[model samples]
Target chain A: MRVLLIAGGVSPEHEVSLLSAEGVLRHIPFPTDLAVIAQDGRWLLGEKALTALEAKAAPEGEHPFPPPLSWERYDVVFPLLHGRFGEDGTVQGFLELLGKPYVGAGVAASALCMDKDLSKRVLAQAGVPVVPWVAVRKGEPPVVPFDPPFFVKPANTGSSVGISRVERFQDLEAALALAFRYDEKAVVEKALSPVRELEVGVLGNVFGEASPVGEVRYEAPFTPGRAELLIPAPLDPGTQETVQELALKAYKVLGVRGMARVDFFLAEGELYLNELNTIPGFTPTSMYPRLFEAGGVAYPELLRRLVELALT
Target chain B: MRVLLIAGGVSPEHEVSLLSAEGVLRHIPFPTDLAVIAQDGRWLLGEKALTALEAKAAPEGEHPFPPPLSWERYDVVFPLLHGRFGEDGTVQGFLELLGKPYVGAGVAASALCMDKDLSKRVLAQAGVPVVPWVAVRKGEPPVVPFDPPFFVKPANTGSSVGISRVERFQDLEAALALAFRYDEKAVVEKALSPVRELEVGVLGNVFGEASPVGEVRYEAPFYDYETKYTPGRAELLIPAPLDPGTQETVQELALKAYKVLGVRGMARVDFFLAEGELYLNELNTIPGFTPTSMYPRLFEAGGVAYPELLRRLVELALT
Candidate 1:
């Protein structure tokens, strides 16, 4: 099948996207023609691809990657770009207009994931368990005192970019200021300490399965910006079952498709879903690929599944 | 100055828009062309400009609206259309992309005004007096109960399209059903009655002023479909003043430019301001400009004379 792999973005997670793209290319076993729409907004074709899209505007110059021969040519597209214009339904809207379907998430789902406040509201309305948190507007001070230590982050940004741990009220102001620096709408959610962090990856569209649960274990004394990842998190049968159930609930409620990794923090028998990743990390050693293979599908087999899903 | 007036819509208030367009035509001193982007989705242009827009389409196996003309050709456009795509950001967005300057509330204000739930939230945040209300999602009924005699409406519709007066719990279900039929978001506000209804017309940008307070004496027993245009029975007092201080506050805060409603041209900010407190009613992005309409007259008395104001609207729209 003819498939196009577009990646890298104008998003903050550009590096992570490149890594994921490389990993997908290594494992994709098909007669596929590769195309990378670089962060510079230029489409690159084959192995000798262009670095920037601006060059296309040059008069009388041949575009390194000609505007995809024809819209009707490609059978499917694997748009692995994350955040901002790519995953936030803008690209999906264009794709929808062009009458083509791609892997993972539709317009409504893409829109919901980017808007954290709306996502939380929909999740609560859908009977999903979410921590009690208030969505404060820009310029408004944090409404309720964010009891002792809590997790504060920009509502829309992917990755732990502006995340900070506030120990006291004195540091809360600085944390809020820094978080707001990245994005206007920053949410200060209460931290779930004394909790186990687990990640479970879900793959496929119509008929998808949850992979073996992966955990993030802080081996030595816990410090900011450092953590050890353990694939296929070690837990009892009951704990694994609970994690998988919550992961699926998060996946289905958010309308996430193709691929997603649902993260949760389990504390005192109660599990609160921290957030969802429509495009989770996919490095060679990444748990998303590792845990799925451990559960029974190999890396080559998983990438083939994604291509098959997009083709359908 | 050359100005174009577009009117008639798919809204329930289509007739009102036609009346408003006629009203505006009677007052404007500028060289003008009037056309109606009719409900059937045709653009009219001719002696009866509206009928022209209504008749214009790809004739005999052609496309509609004459290949979409640019609004930049005209100095300004007064789209007197109301509700649905007319007042919502949909039309404004197209015009914006087309690089056309228009009158009335802009996209954000237009969209937010159509959204009752967002209006209450924004108004409350701006420290305005809003009645207690609960916004319910399409299917999920929130437990935040309001007292009986509530006004239920579809959040994103204007001109009182999908509204039902819920007098009791038994009627609540029916009222919600009617409202949900129009929009996914429904707002249930505790109905305010037994108080005199007041109206105010606000004009200008962020620095605009409110008009002399007006009182609406409705002859209809209740707000319903017929009450919308049950003309000649209602009374309007132009200077419905209260005790000096309260009246000034009502005029000052009763209407501010609806930044969220996407109002860019001009708007008539309506409110039920009484007893020193004001409750924002709704905004008309494409307000009525009928021969007898107070919207134009209100601007006339506000120092900008009527014909001059129309000319100024054209001037602002040009460059």
Candidate 2:
């Protein structure tokens, strides 16, 4: 099986995307090629000495910017990049028009998941428990329907770059302005009780099948050493079963295909579903892959099954 | 201003698209150029003497299937085409990635509106009244969640093609088979009381401005004149003879739907009024643009002529 792996997007998660691409390259047991989208939106192919670090730099060779319409040349296009042009349905739509079969979600689902405010509405309607929030559009002042000590962020950005914890009412305007700089729509969510971060790996089309649940222990605003993962999430069996079921339900509600990492918050014995990552981080030690690895599905086998999922 | 008029797409509505294109050609005062999409999806440009009827035929000259992606040649692209590839966000996304501005909704909105089952969910969640229906996907047996008197149709198609009226429980299977022939997902809507067809024209960039409501009167299976010409077979009651309060309600619902879908440039909001209640039928992002078409005629009746309306849309796109 020949696969075309795409990486290095124009999102804030550019380095993260490259790291995930490196992990994918190490494990994918197939004849794979590379298409690197530079931060400036140029397409670089056929680089012999392409490393994850090297892919971060601008291309030296003369290649197509924005690429030509040649997705049909490969058997399947695996967009290993995350956020914006890569994960937000822009490239998916472009690939669809080229009649190229690609991995991951379709245009509508990708676009829906990228916009947090919109996806929450759909999920909440499907009876999923979510964080309470208010959506603030452009040209409108931020409305704090919830009390102070809320989280303010851009509604469309896929990462935590534009996020701020507003401890007091005075910081609301500044945080809203910071979020609006990244996107036209801004979202502010109520800060509920203290919580534990739980995650589950979901694989399959809308079949609602999921792997074991995992827990991420971290300090406030999670730095590298400050965060650690515990697979099989030392929770009571009943709570573990509950989170897995909730994860699968959210996956189906969002219409996620191929794979996703569904995050959750366990606070005061109540589990509130958090955001979903349609294309989660896939480093060898990334939580998404590690969670499944604990279930006896190794890294190489996981990559193979992902490609099979794409084909199906 | 230079406007690139795209017409005659690879959809089942290719012929209807050309007819609309011809009407647009007659009214658009700008220096408009044309690019015709063959039914096989090739882009044909600079066809020396192209006409509405001739555009329906296959191009005699060789051209690229996707043509060249040179949308920068024109100030704005008016994708006057309809149905699948043209109106279903494929071309919209192509234009967006190319950094060229076009008329109509963006990628997410266009794709959402093209999908009936999904869009209905969004609309219903927004408190808009919609006909009750159950969506049936492939490999699943047809489920009749509603009454026997329902309509079975493909969820993605733009118009009346591949639609059947299932008046009895036995006919459900055949109707579903016919619908699945057009699309993988089929929707079955419960048929309500004998209804009056109502339409309203919406124009703005989320501003939710609306034109006067118009009503369409036609017989069963609709005559060619009723389907084709505005004044021939169907009686168009401009400012439809309904209570002023009900008119405002329908208009407000359409505006809400339009805003929720984030439609831009223009759209025709269709509704069905049954037993003194209004239920939103569907939204046509790129509605028929003939001079006598409901959208244009309503605007013209409200005193904005066809040329002014087109110019306003182009200006909206530029800004």
lDDT of 2 by residue, B169-219 (tens): 899888888888887788899998699989999877866579999999874
Off by over 4 Å in 1: A1-312, B26-31, B46-67, B157-159, B220-232, B255-263, B274-276, B314-319
lDDT of model 1 at position B67:
23
Candidate 2's DockQ: 0.47
CAPRI quality band, candidate 2: acceptable
Assess the local accuracy of residue B40 in candidate 2 as a C-alpha lDDT between 0 and 100: 68
Interface RMSD of each: 8.2, 1.9
Using Cα atoms with residue i matched to residue i, what is each candidate's TM-score against the true structure? Answer: 0.57, 0.90
Per-candidate alpha-carbon RMSD to the true structure: 8.9, 3.5
Question: lDDT winner among the candidates?
Answer: 2
